[PDB]
Short mmCIF file of C-alpha atoms in Angstrom, two decimals:
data_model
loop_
_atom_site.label_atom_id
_atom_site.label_comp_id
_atom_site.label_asym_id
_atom_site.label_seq_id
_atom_site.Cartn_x
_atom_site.Cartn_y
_atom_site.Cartn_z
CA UNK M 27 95.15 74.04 -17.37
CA UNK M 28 98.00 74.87 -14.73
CA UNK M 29 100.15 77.18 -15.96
CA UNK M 30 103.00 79.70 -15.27
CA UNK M 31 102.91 83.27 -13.38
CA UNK M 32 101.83 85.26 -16.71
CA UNK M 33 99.21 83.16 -17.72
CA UNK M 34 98.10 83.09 -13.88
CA UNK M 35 98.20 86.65 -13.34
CA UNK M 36 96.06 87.20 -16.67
CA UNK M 37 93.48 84.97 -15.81
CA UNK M 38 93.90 86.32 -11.80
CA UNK M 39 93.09 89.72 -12.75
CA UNK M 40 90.29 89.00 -15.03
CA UNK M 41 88.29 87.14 -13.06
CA UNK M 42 88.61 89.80 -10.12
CA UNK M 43 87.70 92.70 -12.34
CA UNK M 44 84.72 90.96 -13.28
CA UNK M 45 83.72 89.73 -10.30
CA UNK M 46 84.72 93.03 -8.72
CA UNK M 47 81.90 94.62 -10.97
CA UNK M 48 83.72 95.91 -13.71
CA UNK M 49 80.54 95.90 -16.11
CA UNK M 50 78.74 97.54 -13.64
CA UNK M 51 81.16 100.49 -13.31
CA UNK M 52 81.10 100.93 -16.99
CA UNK M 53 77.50 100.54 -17.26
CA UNK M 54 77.00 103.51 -14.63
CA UNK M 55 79.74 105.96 -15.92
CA UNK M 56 78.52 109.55 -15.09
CA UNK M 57 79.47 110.86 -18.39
CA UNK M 58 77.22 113.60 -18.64
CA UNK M 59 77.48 114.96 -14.64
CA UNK M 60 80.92 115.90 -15.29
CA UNK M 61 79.49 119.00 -17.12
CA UNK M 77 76.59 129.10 -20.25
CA UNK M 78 73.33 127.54 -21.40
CA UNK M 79 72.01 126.97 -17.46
CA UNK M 80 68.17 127.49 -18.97
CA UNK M 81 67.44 123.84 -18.75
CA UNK M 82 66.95 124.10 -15.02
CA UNK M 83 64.85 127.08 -15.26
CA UNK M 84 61.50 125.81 -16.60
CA UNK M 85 60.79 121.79 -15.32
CA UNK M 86 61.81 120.11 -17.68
CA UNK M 87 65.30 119.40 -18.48
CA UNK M 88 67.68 117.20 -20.40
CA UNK M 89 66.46 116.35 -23.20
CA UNK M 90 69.83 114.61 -23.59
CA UNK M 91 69.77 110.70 -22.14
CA UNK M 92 73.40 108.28 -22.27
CA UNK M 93 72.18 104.91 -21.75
CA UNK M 94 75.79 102.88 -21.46
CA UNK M 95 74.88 99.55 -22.94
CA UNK M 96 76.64 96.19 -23.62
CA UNK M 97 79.46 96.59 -21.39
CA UNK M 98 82.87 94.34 -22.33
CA UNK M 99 85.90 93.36 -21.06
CA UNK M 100 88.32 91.84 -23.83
CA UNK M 101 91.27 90.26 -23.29
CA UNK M 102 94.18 91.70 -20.81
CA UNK M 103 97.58 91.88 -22.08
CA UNK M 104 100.85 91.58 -20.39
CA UNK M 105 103.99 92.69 -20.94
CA UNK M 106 107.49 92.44 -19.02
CA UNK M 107 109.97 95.72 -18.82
CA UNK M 108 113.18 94.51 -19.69
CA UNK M 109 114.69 94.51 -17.05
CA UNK M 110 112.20 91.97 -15.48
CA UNK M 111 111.09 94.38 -12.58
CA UNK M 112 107.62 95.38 -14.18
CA UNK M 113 104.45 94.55 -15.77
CA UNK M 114 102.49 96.57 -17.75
CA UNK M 115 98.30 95.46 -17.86
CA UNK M 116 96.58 96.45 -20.71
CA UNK M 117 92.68 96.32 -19.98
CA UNK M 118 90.44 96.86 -23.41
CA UNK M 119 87.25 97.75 -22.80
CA UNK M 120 84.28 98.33 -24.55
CA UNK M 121 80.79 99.96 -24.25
CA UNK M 122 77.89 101.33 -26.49
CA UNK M 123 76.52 104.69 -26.16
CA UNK M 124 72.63 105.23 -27.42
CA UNK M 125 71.66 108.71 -27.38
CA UNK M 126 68.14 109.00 -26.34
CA UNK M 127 66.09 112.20 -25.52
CA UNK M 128 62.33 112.14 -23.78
CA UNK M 129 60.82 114.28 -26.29
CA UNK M 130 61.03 111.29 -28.41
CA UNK M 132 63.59 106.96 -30.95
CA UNK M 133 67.19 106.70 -30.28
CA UNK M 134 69.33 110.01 -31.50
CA UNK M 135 71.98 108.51 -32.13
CA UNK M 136 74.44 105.18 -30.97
CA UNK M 137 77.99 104.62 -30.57
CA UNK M 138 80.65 101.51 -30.13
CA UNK M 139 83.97 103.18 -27.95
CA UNK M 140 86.68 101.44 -27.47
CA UNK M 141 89.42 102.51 -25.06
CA UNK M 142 92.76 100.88 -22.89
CA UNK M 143 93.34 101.12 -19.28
CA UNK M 144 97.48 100.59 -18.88
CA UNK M 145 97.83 99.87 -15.22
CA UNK M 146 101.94 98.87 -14.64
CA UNK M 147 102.69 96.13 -11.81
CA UNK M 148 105.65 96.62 -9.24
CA UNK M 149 107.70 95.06 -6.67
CA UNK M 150 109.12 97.41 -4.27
CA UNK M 151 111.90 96.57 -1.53
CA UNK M 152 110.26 98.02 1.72
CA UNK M 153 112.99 99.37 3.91
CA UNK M 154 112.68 97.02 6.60
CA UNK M 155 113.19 93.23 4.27
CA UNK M 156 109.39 92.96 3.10
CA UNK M 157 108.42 93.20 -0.43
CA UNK M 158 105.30 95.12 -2.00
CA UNK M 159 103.28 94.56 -5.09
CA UNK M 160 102.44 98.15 -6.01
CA UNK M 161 100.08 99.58 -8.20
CA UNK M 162 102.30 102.17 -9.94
CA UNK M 163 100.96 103.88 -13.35
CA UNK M 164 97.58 103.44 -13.99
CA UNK M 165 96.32 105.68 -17.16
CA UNK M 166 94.22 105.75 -20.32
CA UNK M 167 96.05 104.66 -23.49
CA UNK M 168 96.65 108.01 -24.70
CA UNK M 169 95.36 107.21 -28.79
CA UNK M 170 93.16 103.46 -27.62
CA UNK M 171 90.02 105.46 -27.72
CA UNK M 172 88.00 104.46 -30.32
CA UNK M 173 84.23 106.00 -31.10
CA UNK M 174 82.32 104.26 -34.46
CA UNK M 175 78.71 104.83 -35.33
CA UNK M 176 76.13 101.88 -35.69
CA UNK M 177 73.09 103.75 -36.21
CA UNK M 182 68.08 113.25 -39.63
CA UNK M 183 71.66 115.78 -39.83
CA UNK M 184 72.97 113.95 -36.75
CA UNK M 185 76.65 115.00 -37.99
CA UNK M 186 76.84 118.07 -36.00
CA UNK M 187 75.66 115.89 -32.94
CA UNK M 188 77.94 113.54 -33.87
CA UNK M 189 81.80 114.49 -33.47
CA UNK M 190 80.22 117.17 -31.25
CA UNK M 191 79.56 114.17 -28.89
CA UNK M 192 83.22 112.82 -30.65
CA UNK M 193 84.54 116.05 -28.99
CA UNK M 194 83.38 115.51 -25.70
CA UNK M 195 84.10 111.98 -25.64
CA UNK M 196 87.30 112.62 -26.62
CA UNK M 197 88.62 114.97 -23.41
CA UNK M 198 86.15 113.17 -20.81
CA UNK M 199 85.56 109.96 -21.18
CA UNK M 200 89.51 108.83 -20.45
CA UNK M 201 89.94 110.66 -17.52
CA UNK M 202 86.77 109.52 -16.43
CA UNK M 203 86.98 105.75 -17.44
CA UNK M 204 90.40 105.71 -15.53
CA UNK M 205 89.16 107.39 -12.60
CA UNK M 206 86.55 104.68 -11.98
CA UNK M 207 88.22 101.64 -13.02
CA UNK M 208 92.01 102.00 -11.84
CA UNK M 209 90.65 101.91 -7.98
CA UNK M 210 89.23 98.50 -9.23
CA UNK M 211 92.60 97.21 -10.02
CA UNK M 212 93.70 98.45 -7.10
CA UNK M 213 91.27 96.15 -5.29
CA UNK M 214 91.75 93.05 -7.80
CA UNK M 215 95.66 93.40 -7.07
CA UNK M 216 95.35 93.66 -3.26
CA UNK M 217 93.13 90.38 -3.13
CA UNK M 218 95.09 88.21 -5.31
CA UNK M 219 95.70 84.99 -4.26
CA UNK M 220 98.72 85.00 -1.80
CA UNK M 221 101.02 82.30 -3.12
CA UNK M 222 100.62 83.51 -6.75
CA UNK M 223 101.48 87.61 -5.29
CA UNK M 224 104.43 86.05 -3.63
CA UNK M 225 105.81 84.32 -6.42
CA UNK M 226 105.22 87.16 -8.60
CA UNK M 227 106.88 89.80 -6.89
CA UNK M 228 109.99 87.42 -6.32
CA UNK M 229 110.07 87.36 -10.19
CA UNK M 230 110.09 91.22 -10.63
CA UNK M 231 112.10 92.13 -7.77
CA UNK M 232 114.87 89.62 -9.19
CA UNK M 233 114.49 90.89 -12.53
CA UNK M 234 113.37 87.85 -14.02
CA UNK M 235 110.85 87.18 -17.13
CA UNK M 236 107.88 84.74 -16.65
CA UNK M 237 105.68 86.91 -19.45
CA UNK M 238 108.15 85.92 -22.67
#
């Protein structure tokens, strides 16, 4: 079960995303507060829209070295389900998305002698997202919803998750942070 820095650092930042709440973030995405039909308001009702964000997942992270040895690059797949609901109601509709956080791994010479594990890049995959339907003409809902998806849930799935490996990086376990940024800074491979 011991094993070397790649292996350690996969298994390191798993566990702290997890236990960091991971599924909860992606369970309690705000996709629909992020958004000339005001009307709803008006009467006392309103909606009738509903995304429940079910079955949240964490697959397994990915690492990669630069070549030159001084970076990593994280990839964190990630899955949820979308049911579209609506309380004048029976499910509308339900979804499976798929979609990669790339967050990229420094070490950085501080000025003084000290040496810093950064957080550089931390993005969507630009073409990871990945919407399929499980289960009326629901087609114009569908890849209607596909076309929202598509421009907010990336920005918004990095935005909430990227702090998070922020905070998994910061409270790695010492030893393994200092013999991983030796690695990098030296420019030498441990993920082969």
């Amino acid at each position: 079960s011991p094993t070397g820095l790649c292996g350690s650092l996969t298994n390191a930042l798993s566990n702290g995303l997890l236990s960091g709440g991971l599924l909860g973030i992606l369970e309690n995405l705000p996709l629909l507060d992020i958004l000339g039909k005001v009307t709803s308001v008006i009467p006392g009702l309103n909606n009738i829209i509903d995304i429940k964000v079910t079955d949240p997942q964490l697959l397994e992270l990915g690492l990669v070295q630069s070549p030159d040895g001084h970076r990593l690059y994280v990839t964190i797949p990630l899955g949820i389900k979308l049911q579209v609901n609506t309380p004048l109601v029976a499910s509308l509709l339900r979804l499976a998305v798929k979609l990669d956080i790339t967050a990229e791994i420094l070490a950085v010479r501080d000025k003084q002698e000290r040496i810093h594990l950064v957080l550089g890049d931390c993005t969507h995959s630009p073409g990871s997202l990945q919407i399929s339907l499980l289960d009326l003409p629901i087609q114009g809902l569908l890849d209607s919803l596909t076309g929202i998806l598509n421009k907010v849930l990336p920005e918004l799935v990095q935005g909430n998750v990227c702090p998070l490996v922020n905070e998994v990086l910061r409270g790695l376990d010492i030893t393994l942070v200092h013999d991983i940024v030796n690695m990098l800074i030296h420019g030498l491979q441990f993920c082969i």
